[PDB]
Write an enzyme that holds these catalytic residues in place. Structure first.
Site, PDB file in Angstrom:
ATOM      1  N   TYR A 239       0.829  -1.197   0.000  1.00 36.72           N
ATOM      2  CA  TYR A 239       0.000   0.000   0.000  1.00 36.72           C
ATOM      3  C   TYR A 239       0.859   1.240   0.000  1.00 36.72           C
ATOM      4  O   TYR A 239       2.058   1.183   0.294  1.00 36.72           O
ATOM      5  CB  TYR A 239      -0.875   0.026   1.270  1.00 36.72           C
ATOM      6  CG  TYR A 239      -0.084   0.267   2.547  1.00 36.72           C
ATOM      7  CD1 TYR A 239       0.197   1.573   2.997  1.00 36.72           C
ATOM      8  CD2 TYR A 239       0.429  -0.800   3.282  1.00 36.72           C
ATOM      9  CE1 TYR A 239       0.971   1.794   4.133  1.00 36.72           C
ATOM     10  CE2 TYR A 239       1.201  -0.590   4.416  1.00 36.72           C
ATOM     11  CZ  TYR A 239       1.468   0.707   4.834  1.00 36.72           C
ATOM     12  OH  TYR A 239       2.224   0.891   5.964  1.00 36.72           O
TER      13      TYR A 239
ATOM     14  N   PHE B 151       2.435   9.712   2.798  1.00 36.95           N
ATOM     15  CA  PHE B 151       2.875   9.752   4.178  1.00 36.95           C
ATOM     16  C   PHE B 151       3.422   8.411   4.649  1.00 36.95           C
ATOM     17  O   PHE B 151       4.144   8.350   5.641  1.00 36.95           O
ATOM     18  CB  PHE B 151       1.754  10.273   5.104  1.00 36.95           C
ATOM     19  CG  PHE B 151       0.561   9.345   5.238  1.00 36.95           C
ATOM     20  CD1 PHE B 151      -0.598   9.578   4.516  1.00 36.95           C
ATOM     21  CD2 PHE B 151       0.587   8.270   6.123  1.00 36.95           C
ATOM     22  CE1 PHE B 151      -1.716   8.756   4.676  1.00 36.95           C
ATOM     23  CE2 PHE B 151      -0.521   7.448   6.285  1.00 36.95           C
ATOM     24  CZ  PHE B 151      -1.671   7.692   5.561  1.00 36.95           C
ATOM     25  N   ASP B 152       3.100   7.336   3.933  1.00 38.77           N
ATOM     26  CA  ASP B 152       3.579   6.006   4.305  1.00 38.77           C
ATOM     27  C   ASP B 152       3.456   5.069   3.108  1.00 38.77           C
ATOM     28  O   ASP B 152       2.577   5.243   2.268  1.00 38.77           O
ATOM     29  CB  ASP B 152       2.768   5.451   5.482  1.00 38.77           C
ATOM     30  CG  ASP B 152       3.397   4.214   6.098  1.00 38.77           C
ATOM     31  OD1 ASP B 152       4.629   4.031   5.986  1.00 38.77           O
ATOM     32  OD2 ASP B 152       2.658   3.429   6.727  1.00 38.77           O
TER      33      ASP B 152
ATOM     34  N   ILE C 101      -7.031   0.622  10.621  1.00 38.81           N
ATOM     35  CA  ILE C 101      -8.167   1.521  10.667  1.00 38.81           C
ATOM     36  C   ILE C 101      -9.420   0.850  10.097  1.00 38.81           C
ATOM     37  O   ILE C 101      -9.334  -0.006   9.210  1.00 38.81           O
ATOM     38  CB  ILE C 101      -7.871   2.845   9.945  1.00 38.81           C
ATOM     39  CG1 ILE C 101      -7.506   2.597   8.481  1.00 38.81           C
ATOM     40  CG2 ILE C 101      -6.732   3.584  10.663  1.00 38.81           C
ATOM     41  CD1 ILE C 101      -7.224   3.857   7.718  1.00 38.81           C
TER      42      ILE C 101
ATOM     43  N   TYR D 225      -8.380   8.212  11.324  1.00 34.73           N
ATOM     44  CA  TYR D 225      -7.846   8.711  12.594  1.00 34.73           C
ATOM     45  C   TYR D 225      -8.635   9.800  13.338  1.00 34.73           C
ATOM     46  O   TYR D 225      -8.132  10.360  14.312  1.00 34.73           O
ATOM     47  CB  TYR D 225      -6.378   9.110  12.427  1.00 34.73           C
ATOM     48  CG  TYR D 225      -5.517   7.958  11.957  1.00 34.73           C
ATOM     49  CD1 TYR D 225      -5.236   7.780  10.601  1.00 34.73           C
ATOM     50  CD2 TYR D 225      -4.975   7.046  12.868  1.00 34.73           C
ATOM     51  CE1 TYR D 225      -4.436   6.731  10.163  1.00 34.73           C
ATOM     52  CE2 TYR D 225      -4.166   5.984  12.438  1.00 34.73           C
ATOM     53  CZ  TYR D 225      -3.899   5.842  11.085  1.00 34.73           C
ATOM     54  OH  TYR D 225      -3.037   4.858  10.652  1.00 34.73           O
TER      55      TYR D 225
ATOM     56  N   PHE E 108      -5.704   5.553  -0.066  1.00 33.99           N
ATOM     57  CA  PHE E 108      -4.768   4.440  -0.092  1.00 33.99           C
ATOM     58  C   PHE E 108      -4.799   3.668  -1.406  1.00 33.99           C
ATOM     59  O   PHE E 108      -5.870   3.355  -1.932  1.00 33.99           O
ATOM     60  CB  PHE E 108      -5.092   3.446   1.031  1.00 33.99           C
ATOM     61  CG  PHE E 108      -4.742   3.930   2.413  1.00 33.99           C
ATOM     62  CD1 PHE E 108      -5.676   4.612   3.184  1.00 33.99           C
ATOM     63  CD2 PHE E 108      -3.485   3.682   2.954  1.00 33.99           C
ATOM     64  CE1 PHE E 108      -5.367   5.039   4.470  1.00 33.99           C
ATOM     65  CE2 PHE E 108      -3.164   4.106   4.244  1.00 33.99           C
ATOM     66  CZ  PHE E 108      -4.108   4.787   5.002  1.00 33.99           C
TER      67      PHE E 108
HETATM   68  N   NH4 Z   1      -6.712   9.214  16.329  1.00 29.19           N
END
Ligand code: NH4
Length: 107
Positions: free
Chosen positions: A26, A36-37, A56, A82, A99
């Site tokens: 991913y 970011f990742d 998540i 989040y 994503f």
């Molecule tokens: N959070």
């Protein structure tokens, strides 16, 4: 919620069941496209067991709609990611995340 858009089809038959381990690659990005990742950068697939809330909510619900081999773009609202607090330093408050996820196999 989470919106799943196909980028490349999977087998269209093998869907993840609660308790199975999903192996995926991913790339996570913020609304603006800022990455970011990414497991792809680490050249190491990520694993998580569906239903154990190790990820998540948007992943639990979105990946469950993908079939083995499929690559899809998941758009996830704050409440499924989040939330209001986000993750200071990385994920701002009320962030919608995008994503690019590829379901490699199930274990
Ligand atoms: N959070």
């Amino acid at each position: 919620g989470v919106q799943v858009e196909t980028i490349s089809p999977g087998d269209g038959r093998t869907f993840p069941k609660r308790g199975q381990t999903c192996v995926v690659h991913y790339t996570g990005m913020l609304e603006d496209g800022k990455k970011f990742d990414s497991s792809r950068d680490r050249n190491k697939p990520f694993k998580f067991m569906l239903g154990k809330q190790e990820v998540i909510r948007g992943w639990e619900e979105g990946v469950a709609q993908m079939s083995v081999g499929q690559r899809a773009k998941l758009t996830i609202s704050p409440d499924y990611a989040y939330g209001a607090t986000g993750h200071p330093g990385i994920i701002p408050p009320h962030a919608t995340l995008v994503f690019d996820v590829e379901l490699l196999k199930l274990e």
